[PDB]
Amino acid sequence: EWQENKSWNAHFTEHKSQGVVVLWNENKQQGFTNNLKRANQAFLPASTFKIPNSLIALDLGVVKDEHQVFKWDGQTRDIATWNRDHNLITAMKYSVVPVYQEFARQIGEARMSKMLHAFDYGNEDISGNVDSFWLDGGIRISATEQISFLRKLYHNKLHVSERSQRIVKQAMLTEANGDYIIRAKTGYSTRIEPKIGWWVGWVELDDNVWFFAMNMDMPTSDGLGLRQAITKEVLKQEKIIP
């Protein structure tokens, strides 16, 4: 089931922040969180939507593989790393929104909506623009719903090819050492209140997998490093990582 561990609230209070961390122990089929209410509060997915968007693009062939080059559309944008050609690995790594907006236009409203329903992804509502509904549209997902979706991706149980799922999990790679592997996606939702930061993903250990999903209030960008810092504080306190 689900266990509230309110002592984790200290890690947010430490950094004068408010948010939720949700953890799922796959071996034990048990979840933990500092706040059940906020763990089930649905927010815009923002850049964490790159995970389902990648899967759908790959399954439909919009993206042939992780080497396909997606040319810069020639608009100079604020984040310099966006103003260059990308493939799926680097578009994930640098969270290149324009590449993913083009995927969404090519997928189209009908197929996007059908696939999100097949994924059971959040509230499955794509109202808004086809190329920005995960930024300022009707889609909403909670931290606990992020976990449920990621669990299916980990086990290749989403209704897309196994190959699509393997490629997206490769593209999610964030950190690997001799103690753990993290596959994850950050997000920062700014277009609609409340502005929040996301980090969702999982930690692979030798003999278990810990899924995680956190979001936190993010009134300015100065706090963005707290997404990973606070999550790792919780993982460390729980002896999940050294």
Ligand X SMILES: *C(=O)[C@H]([C@@H](C)O)[C@@]1(C)CC(S[C@@H]2CN[C@H](C(=O)N(C)C)C2)=C(C(=O)O)N1
Catalytic residues: 47
Interface pattern 10-49 for ligand X (x via CB under 6 A):
------------------------------------xx--
Both structure tokens of 28: 């034990």
Under the binding rule (CB under 6 A), the answer on residue 57 touching ligand X is no
Hunting for tokens 């083009």 — which residue is that?
A: 102
Which of 7, 170, 208, 237 is close enough to bind Cl ion by CB under 5 A? Answer: 170
Under the binding rule (CB under 8 A), the answer on residue 224 touching a copy of itself is no
Q: 168 vs 214, which CB is nearer to Cl ion?
A: 168
**Helix axis angle, 143-154 to 162-171, nearest 10°:** 120
Range in contact with Cl ion (rule: CB under 5 A) among 62-70, 72-80, 116-124, 164-172: 164-172
Q: What's the min distance (Å) between Cβ of 47 and ligand X? A: 2
Both structure tokens of 43: 């927010």
In the window 15-34, what residues touch Cl ion (CB under 5 A)?
none
CA-CA distance, 150 to 74, in Å (whole number)? Answer: 34
Q: What's the min distance (Å) between Cβ of 160 and a copy of itself? A: 15
Under the binding rule (CB under 5 A), the answer on residue 97 touching Cl ion is yes
Q: What's the min distance (Å) between Cβ of 103 and a copy of itself? A: 20
Which of 5, 41, 90, 113 is close enough to bind a copy of itself by CB under 8 A? Answer: 90
35 close to 3: Cβ distance less than 8 angstroms: no
52 close to 120: Cβ distance less than 8 angstroms: no
Under the binding rule (CB under 8 A), the answer on residue 163 touching a copy of itself is yes
Under the binding rule (CB under 6 A), the answer on residue 112 touching ligand X is no
Q: 9 vs 156, which CB is nearer to a copy of itself?
A: 156
Which residues carry a binding-site annotation for a beta-lactam? 47, 50, 95, 227
DSSP letter assigned to residue 195: P
Ordered DSSP codes for 205-236: -SS-EEEEEEEEE-SSGGGTTHHHHHHHHHHH
Q: 61 vs 74, which CB is nearer to Ca ion?
A: 61
Q: 141 vs 167, which CB is nearer to a copy of itself?
A: 167
Ordered DSSP codes for 38-103: HHT--B--GGGGHHHHHHHHHHHTSS-STT--B---S---SSGGGSS-B-HHHHHHTT-HHHHHHH
Hunting for tokens 């969404």 — which residue is that?
A: 104
